[PDB]
Design a binder for these strands. Structure first.
Lengths: 92, 165, 96, 174, 159
RNA sequence: GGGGAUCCCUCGCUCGCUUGUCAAACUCCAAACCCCCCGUCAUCCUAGAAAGUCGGAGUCCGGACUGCUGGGGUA
RNA sequence: CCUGGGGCGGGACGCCCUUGAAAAGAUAUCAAGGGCGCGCAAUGGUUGACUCAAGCGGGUCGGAAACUCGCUGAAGAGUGCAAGAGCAUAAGUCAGCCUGACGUUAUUCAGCAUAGCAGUGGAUGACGAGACGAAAGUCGGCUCUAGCGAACUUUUGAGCC
RNA sequence: GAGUUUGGCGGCCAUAGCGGUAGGGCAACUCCUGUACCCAUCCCGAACACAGCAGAUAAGCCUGCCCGCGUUCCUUACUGUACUGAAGUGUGCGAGCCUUCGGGAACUCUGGAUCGCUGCCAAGCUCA
């Protein structure tokens, strides 16, 4: 399915309907300095590592389309609950 | 007030295929009618004509008033003011087909254009059929206020003198 | 297997009689009820909004308040008291 | 067309083609009185109507035939007559006590500059509060009756008699 | 497969063939026998079952065959009119592992008849009443229910 | 549309008026039970109605008769 | 794990509709019919204007295969996809303008008859902003009921601690 | 002040629908006449809209009638039948069915009616 790249909607921050550009959200790299990373490094030793030797699970048949809406006026972005589609495109 | 007046006269050209031939047909129909024509759209794709759903196929124009009267006089001229009984509908309407748009003065045959035929149908109503056409209080006309075939033929004889064989 | 949707077993519960299908009489949608009045719940299937659960179809509720267009009703269901929200299109005053 | 027991016949007013029940429901959801404006070919008519379980009830009613007493001799079925009838209805309802309502045109087409909107502007200018947007009003020249410049020299007196009837009706209801 | 299997009525009806699959076609071909056009037969007897039962299409066909043979032999080819009133509408199914998923497969059709319901009606003239009665008794011998013949018209014509 | 050049004529389905039959998953109809609410009588109730709070559990192998043609099943 | 022993087969192991189910509600089985793990910036919102399926008659090698005219036509169509329900001056078709397929938040349902998860219906709530429309209104997606997931962890957004 | 005609908004939503027949418009409505204008046609002043001198009740509308299909209600027969609540040391090899007390159809049939009733307002009128 297609969603427009830019459309007029409500900005929660400036509290008005302005034009907003839609951007697909890319998952970031997990920090190596997080508390879970430090706990993993601390619990690594000889033997089973507990939950840190878990293999990542499976996948749902379709993933949600992670979208982020940036107000064109205040340049702040908000992200809303998103739909779930096999094929996603931007209308231009 | 029971004169079967002419409600409208419709001229339709069923080309059957869109494009430059359709444009030429609509232009010649506009020339011969003196009024903008409208493109008829197919409703079911069919490989016979290879057309798809909602594709322009033909054209038609509706004429009301003295324009319709004059064009009807012309078309009755091309049919030599002749129209047989079987042409008539069960309710006073007629239609007949012609082939040579060159029969209407003011337009010239073109080798590229060819010759396109068309059907003209005049609908004979009675003075007061607005009851079913208006928006507020729109009731269907009773069966005793419609127009019969012999009433329509008598009207045609007494109005344009179109004998029915 | 059998589902647990709201519209479970509603084939005849949410039917209209043959000669009342279509737009319902609009007088039933602008009727006002007083506090403590007893009203029947007779769901109109054509009004797809404001409709209580069909389990309360045929029950008499007591009007305890209003939440805009809709009325709040105290309705007995077995041994519990339920607060049911209903537009007046599905409601009907009890006659004494 | 009752074919049998399974056939469904519409409501009587819909069968007569005099009411839109979807519009009627939308207007009754206001819980405000309806300023019902209906126009015939020869005159225009305005009513103030409230719903009852037994039927509709009318509080106030002005017709174009009432302008003759105030001194109108033009056609009752045009813009000037519609505006005068609207002003008379609004002033009369203000006299009676009702001062609010929502415009109800029924099946009438919504066209800018219509006699319905001339009556609406008359009701508004009578002080009868009613929500609206000015862009649907007729031009003031043809509310005064500038259409008399078209074919009729007899109707060339429409603006002056318009003003005279307006002042007389204001005197009557003020 | 004895008729005692699908004989007692213990269940709801099973007739909506669009929600089932693959019903074998009925063995009964004709339902009107003898002289179909004439209606001015004075005597008119019928066979009524006296129990609530289900009659299979094969039993119906056997009774029809025996009655038709007897009538054609006695009264002639067009000396009678015979009407089989009931159609096999119920679908008979069978459980063909054991009792897990025991809902059966459709094996035939049957007519679910009520007490005092007419099964066959035979119209004949005055002199053929005993032959029709004897043939209809033979037909009733093939049905899975006790039966009785009743005179519908021509009671005063017989006695 | 099935059968042996003027489609020279034979005719199954399809659509109606009558006969004969049907339906869990059909309904133009339509009970008896039953359910909510109102009043009434009746019974209980200040020797404490309805409601609320708290303490202690057992129990989640059941079975039978009489009906529901209960469902499934040849039973 | 369920399972007319277990196994093989299958999933009646999550969600939604009809029947079973005995005209309130509830109601089991490896009971019957089944369906869903989606699609759609339009196939969505609103306003205006229209009315569909299918027959009958008229119209040119435009054939009983097109398009058009007239009559009948409460729906026999369409409404994205199971089933059921709803809808005709429309909840359908076309066209104009649009993005309410909006941020936050309270109740109660009936949300799962529920004491009890995530989550959903609300839609009539409220706050703040809008689209269409004379206004009334309608819009918290697609006419209603399926299309989905705790804790921990990571990543992303706004501002704070 | 009571009633009639017409118009507007409605309620119940066929007892109102579909069909046939005969009458009317002084006012009202309507059909009807045009397209300077406001507004409009995927083309068409057909519609909508505006402005309206005539003609016309042939239509819409109204009144009377018609049982013709549809609907609703009543009546007789079916019939206290079908079905069913409670109870039963009544009964059947059995699937089942029976008696009593209490409720009680549907269809069809005999004969009728039903071709709407009705609320508010306004305007013309008909008054003691």
């Amino acid at each position: 399915m297609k969603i427009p790249k830019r459309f007029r909607t409500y900005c929660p921050f400036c509290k008005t309907h302005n034009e907003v550009v839609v951007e697909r959200v890319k998952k970031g790299q997990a920090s190596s300095m997080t508390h879970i990373a430090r706990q993993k490094k601390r619990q690594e030793g000889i033997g089973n590592s507990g939950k840190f030797s878990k293999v990542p699970g499976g996948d749902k048949p379709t993933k949600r389309i992670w979208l982020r809406y940036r107000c064109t006026v205040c340049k702040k972005a908000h992200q809303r609950p998103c739909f779930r589609a096999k094929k996603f495109e931007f209308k231009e | 007030m029971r004169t079967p007046i002419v409600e409208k006269v419709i001229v339709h050209m069923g080309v059957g295929e869109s494009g430059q031939h359709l444009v030429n047909a609509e232009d010649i129909l506009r020339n011969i009618t003196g009024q903008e024509v409208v493109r008829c759209f197919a409703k079911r794709t069919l490989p016979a004509f290879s057309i798809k759903k909602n594709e322009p196929i033909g054209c038609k124009v509706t004429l009301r008033g003295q324009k319709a009267q004059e064009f009807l006089e012309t078309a009755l001229g091309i049919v030599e003011k002749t129209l047989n009984r079987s042409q008539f509908d069960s309710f006073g309407n007629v239609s007949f087909g012609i082939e040579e748009h060159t029969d209407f003065p003011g337009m010239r045959y073109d080798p590229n254009i060819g010759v396109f035929g068309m059907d003209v149908t005049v609908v004979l109503k009675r003075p007061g059929e607005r009851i079913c056409k208006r928006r507020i209080a729109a009731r269907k006309i009773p069966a005793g206020h419609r127009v019969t075939v012999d009433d329509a033929i008598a009207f045609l004889n007494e109005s344009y003198g179109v004998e029915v064989m | 297997t059998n589902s647990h949707g709201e519209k479970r077993c509603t084939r005849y519960k949410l039917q209209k009689t043959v000669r009342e299908r279509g737009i319902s009489p609009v007088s039933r949608a602008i009727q006002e009820f007083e506090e403590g009045q007893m009203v029947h719940i007779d769901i109109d299937p054509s009004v797809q909004k404001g409709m209580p659960n069909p389990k309360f179809q045929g029950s008499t509720g007591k009007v305890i308040g209003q939440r805009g267009r809709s009325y709040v009703l105290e309705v007995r269901s077995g041994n519990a008291m339920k607060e049911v929200f209903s537009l007046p299109q599905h409601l009907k005053p009890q006659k004494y | 067309m009752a074919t049998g027991p399974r056939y469904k016949v519409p409501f009587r007013r819909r069968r007569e083609g005099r009411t839109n029940y979807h519009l009627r429901l939308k207007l009754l959801l206001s819980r405000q009185d309806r300023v019902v404006v209906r126009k015939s070919s020869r005159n225009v008519q305005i009513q103030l109507i409230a719903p009852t379980p037994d039927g509709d009830i009318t509080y106030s009613s002005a017709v174009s035939n009432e302008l003759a007493k105030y001194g109108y001799t033009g056609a009752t079925g045009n813009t000037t007559a519609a505006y005068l009838t609207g002003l008379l209805f609004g002033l009369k309802s203000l006299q009676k006590g009702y001062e609010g309502g929502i415009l109800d045109i029924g099946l009438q087409a919504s066209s800018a500059g219509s006699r319905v909107y001339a009556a609406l502007k008359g009701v508004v200018d009578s002080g009868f509060e009613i929500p609206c947007s000015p862009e649907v009003f007729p031009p003031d020249e043809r509310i005064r009756g500038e259409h008399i410049a078209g074919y009729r020299e007899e109707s060339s007196d429409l603006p002056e008699q318009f003003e005279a009837t307006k002042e007389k009706i204001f005197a009557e209801f003020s | 497969k004895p008729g005692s299997m699908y004989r007692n009525v213990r269940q709801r009806s099973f007739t909506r063939r669009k929600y089932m699959g693959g019903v074998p076609g009925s063995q009964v071909i004709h339902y009107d026998m003898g002289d179909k056009a004439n209606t001015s037969f004075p005597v008119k007897i019928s066979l009524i079952v006296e129990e609530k039962c289900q009659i299979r299409h094969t039993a119906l066909e056997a009774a029809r065959i025996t009655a038709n043979r007897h009538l054609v032999a006695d009264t002639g080819k067009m000396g009678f009119y015979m009407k089989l009133r009931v159609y096999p509408h119920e679908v008979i199914r069978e459980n063909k592992s054991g009792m897990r998923r025991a809902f059966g497969k459709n094996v035939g059709t049957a007519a679910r008849v009520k007490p005092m319901q007419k099964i066959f009606t035979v119209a004949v003239e005055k002199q053929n009443f005993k032959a029709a009665k004897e043939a209809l008794w033979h037909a009733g011998q093939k049905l899975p229910t006790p039966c009785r013949i009743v005179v519908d018209e021509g009671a005063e014509l017989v006695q």
